[PDB]
Amino acid sequence: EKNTCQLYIQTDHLFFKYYGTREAVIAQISSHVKAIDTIYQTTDFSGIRNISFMVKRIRINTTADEKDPTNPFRFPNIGVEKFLELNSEQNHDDYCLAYVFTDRDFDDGVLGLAWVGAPSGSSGGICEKSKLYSDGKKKSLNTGIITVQNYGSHVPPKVSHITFAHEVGHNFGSPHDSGTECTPGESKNLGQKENGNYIMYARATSGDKLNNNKFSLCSIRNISQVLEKKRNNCFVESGQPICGNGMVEQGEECDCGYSDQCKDECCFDANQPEGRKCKLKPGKQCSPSQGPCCTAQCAFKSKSEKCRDDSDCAREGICNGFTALCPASDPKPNFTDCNRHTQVCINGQCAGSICEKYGLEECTCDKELCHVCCMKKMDPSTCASTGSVQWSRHFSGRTITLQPGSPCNDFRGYCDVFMRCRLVDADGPLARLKKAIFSPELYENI
């Protein structure tokens, strides 16, 4: 209960329809969570120097769900207020925040809606429990909506996970920015205007300015009150054991999610009773989520199977049946080459150049400046390259071309595909003309 907020993020059928696959939806959702975590962690909210996020259930609604009569999110046309209300109509006591990700256009082109937090009174925001409220229905107001399209055009992911930050900030008790100090976009000072407005702006920022990813001083101070009055209510410790998020960790053997999340037949889901949940089923001795060399029928693979493919320092790696995890790779012998013949492997990774494989140290080092340079270890007595006749027993006569891009002449060049290297600074025709004219050409030409 220190610094982490558990999110219940749901995606409607249009989100899946645009992204097509569950993998794409989960990748976008993890990207949004990571972006919002990066935004919030850096922003020192006065009281706390780190406020992370950790999604607990990634619940994704498939296009086939659209035919479900009891699902109210299938309606193609629906107001933003009504959308947020139906998000709040569900029970969300076990979550710091609960969000619905949609791909539907909203009236006036709004990019979503959340519930404004408050330090004291005005129920609604983070760490909010279900209560009767008015209208006769118990609404969990730890809820917010977000759409990835406005005016019929899909919102890019920078703007999408900026408006996600906007909605969570409203859930965090930060109102829309006001004043010249906290809204620099409208400021007539050019230096501040180029920085751009902050996240907590009534109008969606383009996401291409400096302050578009950062919380303002106004918003940070507002969030400070909420995070000093309600943080130790629903937050959790960093890295706390909370299974069902699809992330295997300590205190568990495997993870599946919830009942309608995974098709794994050898791991208990979250709806299973305490103690059994997120654990291997009795009899199924391993899980594919645990290790990459487990059978689809959830049993330890034999010794024939090899987890990994060919590597720069190992052949394949063999796990056999004793653990789900594939063990450390069996390294190739010392001085074993890697990509092209520029370096050799020592301790499972290749570094330290090539020339010490047969034994000599790399030279620092007109086309002879680009392949590889190494002398006899006793000082640059003969700094000749690999293909030189001075090395007639180690490299024979084979020349090793550097990678296309690796610099020559310290770091004022770059090797091309033609064993040559041009200056990275470069001159350019027009700039050469400018330097030939801006110089005192009266005596430079004659």
């Epitope: 009942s259 037949e265 050898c266 208990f268 889901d269 709806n271 299973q272 009773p273 305490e274 103690g275 059994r276 089923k281 009795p282 009899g283």
Partner: antibody, heavy 117, light 109 residues
Framework: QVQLKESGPGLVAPSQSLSITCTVS????????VNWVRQPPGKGLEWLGV???????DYQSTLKSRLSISKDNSKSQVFLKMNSLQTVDTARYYC???????????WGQGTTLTVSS | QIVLTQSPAIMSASLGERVTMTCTVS???????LHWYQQKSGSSPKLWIY???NLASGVPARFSGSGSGTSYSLTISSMGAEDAATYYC?????????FGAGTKLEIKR
Amino acid sequence: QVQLKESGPGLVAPSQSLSITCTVSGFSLTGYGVNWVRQPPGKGLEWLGVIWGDGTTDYQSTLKSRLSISKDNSKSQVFLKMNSLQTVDTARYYCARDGDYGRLDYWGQGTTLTVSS
Amino acid sequence: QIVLTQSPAIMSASLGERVTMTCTVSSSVSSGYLHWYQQKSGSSPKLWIYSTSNLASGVPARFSGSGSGTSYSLTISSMGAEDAATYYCHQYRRSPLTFGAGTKLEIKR
């Protein structure tokens, strides 16, 4: 409260199939597993097999061939089917729920099973 | 494969005494995964102790089990006159679900 009840044929002809139904109530079968433990007359408990919340089954190794357990989550009924029961198969067939940490907290009354030509 | 050895098989304790019940597993299993059920010779085995330290609902407090690892136990502070039942030690952390042989109990009169 939460109760489990088993309906059994009682009399089973030798080498003829058996069907017992444990119509559970009070819990969602999707999140709880219902076991099947039989008991010979005045003997120790014997485990047949279980059906989990996701429909997965794990039977006893010595009764794998004959055992058959299925369920309908919406209908809230657990079904146990046995085939070719010899004279030793007579027992009392209890259905139990796999609670927290594998505990068999709630049990049914059970059905006496008599096998005799 | 696990076998839950329960000793002693037959308990004969006079009224009001302290009778202990021992369940020994073949391989060490988690403390919370072992349980206890009594069966009063014609009734469904009701859960008595779960996690080997927490009592069930509607049970006397004289039952105080304990154990961790390879050997487990169940202790009775005062032998109640209605305790005539077979107490079963059980585990389902690993397949198969193995019930104990059943430590029968009788009132030594």
